[PDB]
Ligand binder design. Structure first.
Ligand SMILES: C[C@@H]1CC[C@@]2(OC1)O[C@H]1[C@@H](O)[C@H]3[C@@H]4CC[C@H]5C[C@@H](O[C@@H]6O[C@H](CO)[C@H](O[C@@H]7O[C@H](CO)[C@@H](O)[C@H](O[C@@H]8OC[C@@H](O)[C@H](O)[C@H]8O)[C@H]7O[C@@H]7O[C@H](CO)[C@H](O)[C@H](O[C@@H]8O[C@H](CO)[C@@H](O)[C@H](O)[C@H]8O)[C@H]7O)[C@H](O)[C@H]6O)[C@H](O)C[C@]5(C)[C@H]4CC[C@]3(C)[C@H]1[C@@H]2C
Ligand SMILES: CC(C)CCC[C@@H](C)[C@H]1CC[C@H]2[C@@H]3CC=C4C[C@@H](O)CC[C@]4(C)[C@H]3CC[C@]12C
Ligand SMILES: CC(C)CCC[C@@H](C)[C@H]1CC[C@H]2[C@@H]3CC=C4C[C@@H](O)CC[C@]4(C)[C@H]3CC[C@]12C
Lengths: 157, 390, 380, 388
């Protein structure tokens, strides 16, 4: 039950409770039924300090959910630009692919998260890593009528 | 200059208000559903039919709404003044329906000059054409006393020929070999099909609204219904026949499928039989498709008459076929009234249309109404704020 | 917080199905059934229905990437609102006998909500709109009941105030929401909706008129006022736009102007010239509002609010012709606006609750928040 | 041969003209007729425009099929009612001809994007013969009550189209097709057909209802069934989709299932709450059909149904027939229960047998059928513009 409380604290951003649980011996790399560890949920909810602290505590950066999503995938899809910045600062793979083949850039482009697209492209995100369906970030941005994202994607090249 | 279109529209509206105040005063619910169908045909049918142009949808539907809204008022005034011979008159559902018919005539003419004129020009054309149309229909119904319940001659042929005369006077040398903007798009053609289908569905109301209640009204509805049905089959068949590799052309399917409703207009309340309505509808679809294929290129490239919507193929030639059918139907004994007066109605409709259209086009030609340049023809952006996104 | 929408796979179905089950149970317990003019009477209600589903549904579809939501959510709102309005009108105006006339009145109640929803569409999900439908239908019913009790008018006839209640309720709800565009094809679809509204509006101006003469004159006045208003709006749009061009979005709303201007007095206007004068003045006010209100969230909703108020003012200016009655009518109007604003504030405060799982402000005007699309990463 | 289609169209039209000359002679229901007309030509026609590259074929072939079908149905239904004698054309003839068109259009929804216009002309002729004879059997032999035609139009059309689609099965399309997909504005256009169908269905179910209480009941019950169906269709679309997203297929089609399901009981004294229950069940059934049964039919049963007409017209039509049986069991109408059951069985069985025969005729390689790669593509039969 302690692990569940730690995961809930990570979700809610209660950094003090999470730190107390970790000090009590709660595993850092615990995860819920969906495979979302504390870093995954912290990235989801945009709790930057939680991300920094979890990274300090030797949490695996490139651990994936059952969908195959890393913390960076989750941050990009959620549109948490600051969290994406911190994750990349700590060495997040910006070109990791999920089981379906989605990259973080694809998720940012599909969700019209322009700043995340900006940062990922500026950090070497390859906009040609297609999905199993054969779609590129430019393709999905065109499909959804995300016009600023499409313009930036073609401009960067 | 800038305020021409707003100034002319307000001055016209104030004139309409004054004329209504000076001349207009206040069966209705029996005919109101048919009037509603006609109203839908005017504002949704004709309006969306013309939205096939890829860069002119806003102007098509919106200027259609401007022309018809003005035209119903002006046609009320003109037709009522003519009927009352300059006296105050009451208005009922029939005045409503007749004013909408006058608007329809203007919209048919507008189909010829679509994409090459300004809203100011359309205001002027509406005002002048309704006068010419009302005088001609008064002549046809009251002097000649011919039978034109569906108005093949008084609306369709008149509107088509008045529009061609204006288009010829307004002829642009630059546009003869086509224009990059004179072109359809996928979703534009689907919108055009909205317009086509509403016209097609509600045409029986159009042809039967002013028919004498009882057998004549029912005959008008039944004849229009089956004529349009037969016209669809022939229009599809001949669109396949005339096109490259047998591919159907949406121009034909959008327009020639209504030729049966146009052509059965004059005979609509006559006892031609349902089989007689189908033969006219089958011929009308054929003639309309052949007009689109062969006569429109001849009219545009050789005669210097550019007809944007090909209204000559839908309203002009099928209009004449309907007038001719009425003369034959009188010879058959299908109808009372003389052959000579049915023929006089066809002659007068065409002649008054071409004469009035020529004088109206001369007025429209003046370089004062902000008409588009040749380069900007068929482009909404001249008059409308166009979204960046399609 | 996460800009990715929260799963509504439990909220929305539970909410909608529980609502429909409750509606069915109430219909079973409280509603009961029951000639020459059956089709004639049915056609008026059908015109109202066409104006509700097609007219208002497509009128708001002009948004670049929110057209699906506008049309479909309008349909859902109509389906909920008519059932609820049947029950509420029955409860506050007596079991509920269901007649074509009661369906017509319930549809009018529903259209009040549909007009109000235009101020908030693109900023709310379906559950929030369910809340808005329920509260707004209830508030309109309460307003009509209070007017009937105080001023001794009929409950059904008090539904004349629907335009002014709808305009002010929607504005208040919009004002409460968190703070945040067009395309050609959605603009044409919205023109289709606007045209159907414009064409069948005379049916809005005489659903509640029993007698034939009043219905005829109301229809004529609405028709001519609307004709004049369309011409003023298209012609005067160029003046009220920075680029001197006609604005399609402005036209979509301004076409109605004369309809709303004569809505509550068309049965009292005795000659068409006066209806045309009111249509012209409504159009000119529409141009002026478009040009001036933005300086002082939805501009069309704001101009409509002035136009509904203009409509009551001309009703007052006329009712004397056909001054204590003036005082009573001003009190009726003030009570209508007061209840509209108060219930709208309550509704906006309820809509702001976290449990609705409302769209993030960065995600407003997007179908992707509510609709399935292919080739998207889903979930986490 | 490129001339097969025009020759067939012209020959069929000449046959129509001759039949009308041989068999046909010359106002309160005209508005209801016009409502039905709108449903036929705008309702179905635009409802089928969801396919991204098949809009022209959907709306235009809808127009063509319905134009042929109204004439041919007028003839067939009239000869059946007159026993080979001349007959007069009333408003009711027009309404019934439009109904025959609706049946053919429902069947067309099953094979949409996989057939040529020539095939659709042939199907219109044969299907209208089968539909008219079944409808005669139900009205005159069984004397069952099916005023909204849950069995005679919707179930019949659905299962006829399914039988045709089964005969015309293409192994290359079982797993899907790149062209078999919607587009954003295409779904927007499809909602036009959805809304017109939803708006005018009460006239559909009440147009030929006996004037007085039966017609009023038809209108009211249809309206409330559709109102309930909208809510349940939205709810179950959300329930069956990932994260509760709404599916345009469901909102375009399952929202109409109330109109189909209440059709048999529409003029029966089932009360508004009974009509609402029927509509709710219909919305649920339709959404579940689209989600789970259509993949089963396509992949395992080799019955590809482009528009999922089984989920809108087939299963809700069967539900409406069953509801008619139950309502008779509860005394809500004076018709025999065995005759309601017989009408349901005959509708389904005649639909299947006629659909198999018709599809066997359509399978002959003489009608310009599209290749597998070219399925769901307007360009096979249309000049397509160069931009969207
Ligand atoms: C259906 C009826 C048939 C009869 C008619 O109406 C429609 O057909 C029309 C068409 O034929 C018209 C003519 C078309 C050709 C026109 C030519 C035009 O001048 C040309 O204008 C171009 C620039 O716009 C050239 O460059 C050049 O400047 C000059 O050559 C002239 O000014 C008027 C013109 C001759 C028109 C006069 C009026 C018409 C004859 C009309 C005539 C009544
Ligand atoms: C109306 C529906 C629901 C049921 C009845 C239709 C039946 C008879 C249909 C549906 C499935 C169809 C089969 C599906 C696929 C094949 C394989 C093909 O290589 C030969 C035809 C054949 C074998 C079809 C024959 C007709 C068929 C059996
Ligand atoms: C379609 C099959 C699976 C059965 C499911 C449909 C059921 C729920 C429908 C079919 C017929 C309906 C009944 C028809 C008639 C009446 C009589 C009325 O005075 C009370 C409601 C009542 C009793 C209805 C209730 C709902 C009902 C029982």
């Amino acid at each position: 039950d302690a692990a569940t409380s730690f995961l809930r604290a990570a979700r809610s951003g209660n950094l003090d409770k999470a730190l107390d649980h970790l000090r009590n011996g709660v595993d850092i790399n615990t995860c819920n039924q969906n495979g979302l560890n504390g870093l995954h949920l912290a990235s989801k909810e945009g709790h930057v300090k939680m991300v920094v602290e979890l990274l300090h505590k030797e949490i695996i950066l490139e651990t994936t959910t059952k969908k195959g999503n890393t913390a960076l995938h989750i941050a990009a899809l959620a549109g948490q630009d600051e969290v994406v910045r911190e994750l990349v600062n700590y060495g997040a793979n910006v070109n990791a692919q999920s089981q379906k083949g989605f990259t973080p850039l694809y998720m940012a482009a599909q969700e019209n998260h322009l700043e995340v697209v900006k940062f990922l492209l500026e950090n070497g995100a390859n906009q040609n890593v297609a999905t199993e369906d054969g779609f590129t970030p430019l393709a999905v941005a065109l499909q959804q009528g995300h016009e600023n994202v499409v313009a930036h994607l073609i401009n960067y090249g | 200059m800038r305020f021409t279109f707003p100034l002319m529209a307000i001055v016209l509206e104030i004139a309409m208000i004054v004329l209504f105040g000076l001349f207009v005063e206040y069966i209705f619910f029996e005919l109101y559903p048919l009037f509603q169908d006609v109203h839908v045909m005017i504002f949704v049918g004709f309006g969306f039919l013309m939205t096939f142009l890829k860069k002119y949808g806003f102007s098509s539907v919106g200027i259609n709404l401007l022309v018809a809204a003005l035209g119903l008022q002006w046609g009320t005034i003109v037709q009522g003044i003519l009927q009352s011979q300059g006296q105050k008159f009451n208005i009922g559902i029939k005045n409503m329906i007749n004013a909408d018919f006058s608007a329809a005539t203007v919209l048919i003419s507008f189909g010829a000059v679509l994409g090459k004129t300004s809203p100011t020009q359309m205001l002027i054309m509406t005002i002048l054409e309704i006068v010419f149309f009302a005088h001609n229909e008064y002549l046809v119904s009251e002097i000649f006393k011919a039978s034109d319940i569906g108005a093949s001659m008084t609306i369709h042929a008149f509107g088509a020929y008045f529009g061609l005369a204006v288009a010829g006077i307004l002829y642009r040398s630059g546009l003869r070999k086509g224009h990059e903007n004179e072109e359809s798009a996928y979703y534009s053609d689907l919108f055009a099909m909205i317009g086509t289908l509403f016209l097609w569905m509600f045409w029986p109301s159009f042809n039967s609204a002013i028919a004498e209640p009882g057998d004549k009204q029912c005959r008008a509805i039944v004849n229009t219904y089956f004529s349009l049905a037969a016209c669809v089959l022939t229009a599809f068949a001949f669109s396949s026949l005339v096109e490259h590799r047998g591919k159907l052309n949406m121009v034909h399917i959008q327009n020639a499928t209504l030729a049966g409703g146009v052509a059965v207009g004059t005979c609509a309340d006559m006892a031609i039989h349902p089989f007689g309505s189908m033969i006219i509808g089958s011929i009308a679809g054929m003639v309309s498709v052949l007009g689109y294929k062969f006569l429109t290129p001849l009219f545009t490239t050789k005669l210097r008459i550019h007809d944007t919507c090909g209204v000559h193929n839908l309203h002009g030639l099928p209009g004449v076929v309907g007038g001719l059918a009425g003369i034959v139907a009188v010879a058959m004994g299908a109808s009372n009234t003389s052959m000579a007066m049915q023929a006089a109605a066809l002659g007068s409709s065409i002649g008054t249309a071409v004469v009035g259209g020529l004088m109206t086009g001369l007025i429209l030609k003046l370089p004062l109404w902000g008409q588009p340049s040749d380069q900007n023809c068929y482009d909404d952006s001249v008059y409308w704020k166009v979204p960046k996104t399609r | 917080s996460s800009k990715y929408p929260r799963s509504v796979r439990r909220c929305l179905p539970l909410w909608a199905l529980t609502l429909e089950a409750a509606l069915i149970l109430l219909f079973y317990f409280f509603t009961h059934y029951d000639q020459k003019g059956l089709v004639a009477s049915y056609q008026v209600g059908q015109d109202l229905t066409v104006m509700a589903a097609l007219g208002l549904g497509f009128l708001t579809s002009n948004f670049r990437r929110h057209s699906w939501s506008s049309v479909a959510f309008n349909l859902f709102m109509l389906a909920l609102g008519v059932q609820w309005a049947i029950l509420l009108d029955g409860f506050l105006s007596q079991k509920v006998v269901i007649t074509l006339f009661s369906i017509r009145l319930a549809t009018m109640s529903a259209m009040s909500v549909l007009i109000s929803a235009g101020a908030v569409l693109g900023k709310v999900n379906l559950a929030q709109l369910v809340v808005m439908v329920l509260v707004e239908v209830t508030a309109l019913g309460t307003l009509r009941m209070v007017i009937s009790n105080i001023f001794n008018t009929d409950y059904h006839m008090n539904l004349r105030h629907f335009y002014v209640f709808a305009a002010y309720f929607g504005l208040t709800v919009a004002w409460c929401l968190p703070k945040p565009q067009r395309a050609t094809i959605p603009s044409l679809s919205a023109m289709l909706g606007a045209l159907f509204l414009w064409m069948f509006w005379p049916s809005v101006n005489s659903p509640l008129l029993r007698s034939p003469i009043q219905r005829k004159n109301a229809m004529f006045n609405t028709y001519y006022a609307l004709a004049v208003s369309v011409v003023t709006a298209i012609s005067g749009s160029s003046l009220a736009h920075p680029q001197r061009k006609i604005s399609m979005t402005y036209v979509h709303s301004a076409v109605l102007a004369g309809g709303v201007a004569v809505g509550t007095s068309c049965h009292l206007i005795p000659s068409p010239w006066l209806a045309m004068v009111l249509g012209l003045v409504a159009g000119l006010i529409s141009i002026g509002g478009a040009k001036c209100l933005p300086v002082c969230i939805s501009v069309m909703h704001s101009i409509f609010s002035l136009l509904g108020l203009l409509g009551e003012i001309t009703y007052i200016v006329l009712l004397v012709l056909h001054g204590f009655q003036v005082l009573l009518s001003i009190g009726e109007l003030s009570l209508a606006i007061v209840i509209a604003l108060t219930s709208g504030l309550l509704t906006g405060l309820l809509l702001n609750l976290k449990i609705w799982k409302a769209p993030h402000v960065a995600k407003y005007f997007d179908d992707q928040v509510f609709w399935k699309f292919p080739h998207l990463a889903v979930g986490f």
